[PDB]
Amino acid sequence: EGSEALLEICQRRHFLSGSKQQLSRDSLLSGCHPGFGPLGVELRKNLAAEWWTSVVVFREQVFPVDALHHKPGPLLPGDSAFRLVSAETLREILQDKELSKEQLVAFLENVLKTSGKLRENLLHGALEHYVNCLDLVNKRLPYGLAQIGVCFHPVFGVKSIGEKTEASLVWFTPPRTSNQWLDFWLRHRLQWWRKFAMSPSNFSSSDCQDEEGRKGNKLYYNFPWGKELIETLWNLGDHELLHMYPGNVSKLHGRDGRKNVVPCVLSVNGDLDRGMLAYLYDSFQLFTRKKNLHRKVLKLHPCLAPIKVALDVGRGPTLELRQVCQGLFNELLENGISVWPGYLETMQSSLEQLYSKYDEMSILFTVLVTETTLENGLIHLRSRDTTMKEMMHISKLKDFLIKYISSAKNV
């Protein structure tokens, strides 16, 4: 199939990490894979930055929050969650013969009810900060708390731990508008996923219900083998908030116009690792002329491509070319454009191989310097989308690139 080719490419160019047998579909989906290579790290960082800009930057009522990766204190007996234990805790009980016959089997109750657990979701940590974050907006009820972080899930060693980095928003709203807002975000998020997609149709939404009768929406991406969940929206009402703060209800009141109410809680939670994998599959695009254009390339969106520009040299006076390339490299880096220093690699291949390698790496532009660049200051530029060659004066390059990315957001 085409999936094997995509996985092979991602392995060769350090998007993923591990071996062929470790990079199975089940391991990638469950989050029990070895990890991601540097290109994957850059792609995930770009995705997280785009999410943060689209969710937090341009709103006056969304603030950041940080939740600890573990939950300490007593836990309800059950749930099969893991338990954190220190070294010497394995000795101080057995030693001195603490009723060593059978009472240390009832000690399993202590183990269940005293050892902490690893964070399973970001909702609880966000809800834990509701009261103190009410001072920021003087209790203007419609407002959100956002976070991006890693969470742990048990997966059937006999039981392993899957790690998934995900973005969560918790939005407190007046009850009478809770449904309307639920629609709004449902559209808004659905736009964001479609914004960077080459085939936004493969992103779909569906309505769903809880066993308690609570409305919700689910977002799916259509991988070649079927639909997979990537984000969930739940209208949870006020049950969790009331349970977390039993006592005087008035402490939880916020302002809806002129009235004091208890807000409904909307929870949006999306998976960033699965979203990154979805975009990787989308960019590879698994019709006679299209078939005859069998060129391997990852047409990632410019805002998400891990590497923007590739820089290299021709043949001629080496020292002067290297000096000009160093200057251009520093100039491009100092204004926020990531570069691949190809000029620092010896010559081992023709332009065809460099083009193939950079297309597999999804680099927007390839820059080439030569003697004629020293003569007149003109460089050659190749674009990933079309592969056509252009001549451009260096004095403008820094601006042009800054334009190309900046306008890409507004396509």
Binding site: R194, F287, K290, L293, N376, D385, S395
Partner: protein
């Protein structure tokens, strides 16, 4: 009585006694015999109709001896003061223009020999008024000039004299021109050219309560007197098919041409700069005197035009009802609230999304195409071989790392080298090239870097461009598409061996062979056009819904949607790309065409202090909400038939699925405590033509087969003519309307059969031809009986043609004269179809005028709290207080009743069939929509009116329910 000689249920006994005269003459024996013979020969004399219930109403007392006198007296009473004001204008002596125009803000009145004094308001009974708006600053009025008998007036805006950094974009009444005298007498008249636009800039016009002020338009009177049709307008403008005596008595609606036609003398000169449309506020500040002079010139020309026009209009339309209706039609009014703003955003954003998805789909296809440049591979593409692939040259003027410490030297040296090489700009031409490396066809699609609307890639691509089908590799029945300059879009059929930048015909043949292995040309269609030479192929036009003469301009037209489903039109990529593109195009076409008009509508928001007390106290009064109004800029008579014209609100589409922004009319929402009561006429023109034929034939209702069939069909039972035609041919009733009215007004059989094929995809050629023949032969027979005599509609056609060929055609009901440009003397037989249609259409205009007069009389008589809202050519809406919503409904029904009887009275009939006495349904609602039950779900609002905006369903009520809810009385205490 309960029946007529032909056993048709007539008006109730009591209502007939109250309306018609007791001493009505009876039909003769011969007329009854002829009618019975006609009906029996057609085969309708047997059918018994189940009678409808009876209605008993104590109507308000009438004036005069009959209906005509009643309506004349009502119209004169309504229209007396404004006619007096017009006469005052006719006899005015105006001093010369002021030597210099004042600069202060507000209103200034110019006394004799130049004296200027500041006045709060003109305070005159009549005026000629004109306004100018700086289009760069938005929609705020800039400056105005007015003239009254013995005085000139100038008005300056606060945004014109003073300079400030910020001007509010939301428009309040405080930023408009004050023109209404507070609570020398009540009525005021305003005259202007395109006067509705000027009315739009009056602060008092936006109050929810009505005003006594009324407006007259010189363009409307020009249309009434000597207007021209669109075809006539084009010919007249191009005159700078056989008869041309009408040219010297007509002109276009432009003010200069009107002045030349009605006044003559020195021409009128414009302002060449056109500052108000292209200039800036400073440019207006510098050229103040010249712009004021031009405004005064336009006002004076309009005043002279009105002076010349008024007597001719009063002569050619002598019935006062016409003037009363024209006065009432110019006070339209639409309420809105904050939701309107959201409606503008939700749609716009939605549109962009649907745009983006489309462009992304096509832009990508463009990018891959660029890869075909290498090796001249493009010479083998069946779709792209004939594009411009030439490139343009770029133009110029004639070993072990160690840690370091002195990195500063390396940094500075690299930076200095970079800047030294950067300074070599002297050899760069001053005008940058535009993507010389890419191919020409791809070069066209990309913007220029200097454009402030630049975006990466070929972001100018759209489905309407002639290149898009080639990029998508569209196929028709396994044949690639192609464009010919003469014949438009077609397809190429390979196989020619008579040799019928070279055509890759072998690639096309291979593609067709591949397609065929999945199921003197040997293919039949629109026929080869050998004038197009593409060696090795035949060119066949794409079929068009209007016949083989027309040319297809775009394969992505809505009419081609079924062909995609059938698989006859297939995209190269395959899957759902083609169908999805066509669906998106259908979904966004209307917004693409109308968003500029819709988003630029002038909206004024009323502050809290200006609202009625009944709105503030209502429990539905949304605090922090905005309440405002829009005044449609309707031309009272923009058509030869004297219909109304509005660029936006008479073209608004009804709320429809899969069409973005279709909820436009649903956004017109009554304020809290107010309701919208509306009604549309049922089978209006059908009934008008039927009754004309009945009067012409024997003087009894239903004496003709056409009228007999028209009268009895009920809407609820689905037995009216529209529903019967729809069932007979199997189309929507909306398409049945088009089919019937096309047949009535001279459509030929080929047109009808093509229309049927368009509306019924499952039909074939022979079936459509048969269904057209079996509906065109029965309605009309042969010309006459000497070696329209035969046919069901022959008498109606004869009557219409007799009226058309008269020396001075007039409307049978009100006797308005047709424009001088269409009389037989000016044109012998040229524009016959337009003249024939004019009779019925102007009769419908008279119907609208009568309805408006009756509604105004009923509202004033019984102190009903409401005002006219809007009308579209047969429909009327009113804004009423909620508690009175029922009473208004009754009034509408009564207004219908009288309106029908009048139509009979002027035709010589003294009775009305019970079937057409009342509106089938009257709508009580909170928003404007075609039906009271629709929730108006569209891509712009998926949840609908009920959930997003909280607008509940309306009610539709018939006469009996209205009587039960009102007890038949219009009084405030039953």
């Amino acid at each position: 009585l309960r029946h007529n000689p032909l056993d048709i249920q007539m008006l109730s006994r009591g209502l007939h006694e109250q309306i018609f005269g007791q001493g009505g003459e009876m039909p003769g024996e011969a007329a009854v015999r002829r009618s019975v013979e006609h009906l029996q020969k057609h085969g309708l004399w047997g059918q018994p109709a189940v009678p409808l219930p009876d209605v008993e109403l104590r109507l308000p007392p009438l004036y005069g001896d009959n209906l005509d006198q009643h309506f004349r007296l009502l119209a004169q009473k309504q229209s007396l003061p404004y006619l007096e004001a017009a006469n005052l204008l006719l006899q005015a002596q105006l001093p010369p223009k002021p030597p210099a125009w004042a600069w202060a803000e507000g209103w200034t009145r110019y006394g004799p020999e130049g004296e200027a004094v500041p006045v709060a308001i003109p305070e005159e009974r009549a005026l000629v008024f004109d306004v100018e708006v700086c289009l760069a600053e938005g929609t705020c009025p800039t400056l105005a000039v007015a003239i009254s008998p013995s005085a000139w007036y100038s008005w300056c805006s606060q945004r014109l004299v003073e300079e400030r950094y910020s001007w509010t974009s939301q428009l309040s009444p405080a930023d408009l021109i004050p023109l209404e005298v507070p609570t020398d007498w009540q009525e005021q008249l305003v005259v202007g050219h395109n006067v509705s636009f000027d009315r739009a800039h009056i602060r008092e016009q936006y109050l929810i309560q009505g005003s006594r002020m009324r407006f007259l338009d010189t363009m409307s009177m020009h249309m009434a007197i000597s207007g021209l049709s669109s075809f006539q307008r084009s010919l007249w403008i191009a005159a700078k098919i056989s008869s041309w005596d009408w040219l010297d008595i007509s002109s276009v609606n432009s003010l200069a041409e009107v002045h030349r036609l009605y006044v003559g003398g020195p021409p009128l000169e414009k302002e060449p700069r056109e500052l108000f449309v292209k200039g800036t506020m400073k440019d207006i500040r510098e050229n103040f005197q010249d712009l004021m002079q031009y405004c005064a010139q336009d006002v004076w020309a309009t005043h002279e035009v009105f002076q010349q026009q008024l007597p001719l209009f009063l002569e050619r339309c002598p019935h006062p009802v016409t003037l009363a209706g024209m006065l009432e039609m110019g006070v339209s009014y639409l309420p809105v609230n904050q939701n309107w703003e959201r409606y503008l955003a939700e749609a716009q954003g939605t549109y962009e999304e649907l745009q983006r998805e489309m462009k992304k789909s096509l832009m990508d296809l463009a990018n891959d195409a660029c890869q075909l440049l290498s090796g001249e591979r493009y010479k083998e593409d069946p779709w792209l071989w004939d594009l411009e692939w030439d490139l343009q040259e770029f133009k110029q003027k004639k070993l072990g790392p160690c840690s370091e410490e002195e990195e500063f030297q390396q940094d500075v040296m690299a930076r200095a080298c970079l800047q030294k090489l950067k300074g070599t700009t002297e050899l760069l031409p001053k005008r940058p090239q535009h993507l010389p490396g890419h191919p020409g066809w791809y070069r066209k699609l990309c913007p220029r870097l200097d454009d402030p609307a630049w975006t990466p890639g070929p972001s100018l691509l759209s489905l309407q461009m002639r290149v898009t089908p080639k990029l998508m590799a569209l196929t028709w029945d396994g044949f690639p598409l192609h464009y010919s300059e003469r014949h438009g879009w077609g397809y190429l059929v390979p196989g020619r061996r008579d040799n019928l930048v070279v055509c890759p015909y072998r690639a096309i043949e291979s593609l067709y062979r591949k397609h065929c292995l999945e199921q003197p040309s040997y293919h039949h269609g629109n026929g080869p056009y050998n004038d197009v030479d593409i060696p090795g192929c035949w060119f066949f036009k794409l079929p068009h819904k209007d016949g083989n003469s027309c040319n297809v301009g775009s394969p992505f037209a809505k009419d081609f949607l079924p062909k995609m489903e059938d698989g006859t039109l297939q995209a190269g990529p395959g899957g759902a790309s083609g169908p999805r593109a066509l669906e998106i195009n259908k979904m966004i076409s209307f917004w693409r065409n109308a968003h500029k008009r819709i988003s630029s509508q002038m909206v004024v928001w009323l502050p809290r202090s200006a609202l009625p007390r009944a709105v503030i106290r209502h429990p539905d009064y949304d605090e922090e909400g905005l309440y405002g109004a829009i005044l449609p800029q309707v031309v009272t008579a923009g058509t030869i038939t004297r219909r109304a014209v509005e660029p936006t609100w008479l073209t608004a589409s009804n709320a429809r699925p899969d069409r973005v922004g279709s909820e436009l009319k649903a956004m017109v929402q009554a304020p809290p405590g107010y309701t919208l009561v509306g009604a549309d006429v049922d089978s209006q023109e059908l009934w008008i033509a039927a009754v004309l034929g009945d009067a012409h034939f024997a003087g009894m209702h239903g004496c003709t087969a056409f009228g007999w069939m028209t009268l009895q069909g009920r809407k609820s039972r689905g037995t009216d003519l529209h529903s019967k035609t729809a069932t007979t041919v199997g189309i929507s009733r909306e398409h049945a309307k088009i089919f019937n009215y096309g047949r009535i007004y001279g459509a030929g059989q080929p047109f009808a059969e093509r229309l049927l094929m368009q509306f019924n995809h499952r039909l074939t050629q022979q079936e459509a031809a048969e269904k057209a023949q079996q509906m065109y032969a029965a309605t009309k027979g042969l010309r006459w009986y000497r070696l329209w005599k035969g046919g069901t509609e022959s008498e109606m056609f004869n009557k219409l043609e007799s009226i058309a060929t008269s020396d001075i055609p007039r409307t049978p009901v009100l006797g308005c004269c047709i424009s001088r440009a269409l009389e037989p003397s000016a044109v012998q037989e040229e524009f016959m179809t337009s003249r024939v249609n004019w009779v019925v259409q102007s009769s419908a205009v008279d119907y609208l005028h009568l309805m408006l007069v009756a509604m105004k009389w009923l509202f004033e008589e019984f102190a009903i709290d409401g005002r006219f809202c809007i009308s579209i050519h047969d429909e009327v809406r009113y804004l009423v207080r909620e508690e009175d919503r029922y009473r208004a409904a009754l009034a509408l029904q009564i207004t219908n009743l009288l309106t029908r009887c009048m139509f009979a009275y002027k035709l010589g009939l003294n009775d009305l069939p019970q079937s057409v006495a009342f509106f089938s349904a009257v709508d009580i609602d909170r928003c404007l929509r075609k039906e009271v039950t629709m929730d108006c779900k569209t891509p712009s609002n998926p949840t609908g009116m009920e959930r997003r905006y909280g607008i509940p369903q309306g009610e539709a009520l018939d006469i009996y329910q209205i009587i039960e809810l009102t007890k038949g009385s219009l009084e405030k205490r039953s």
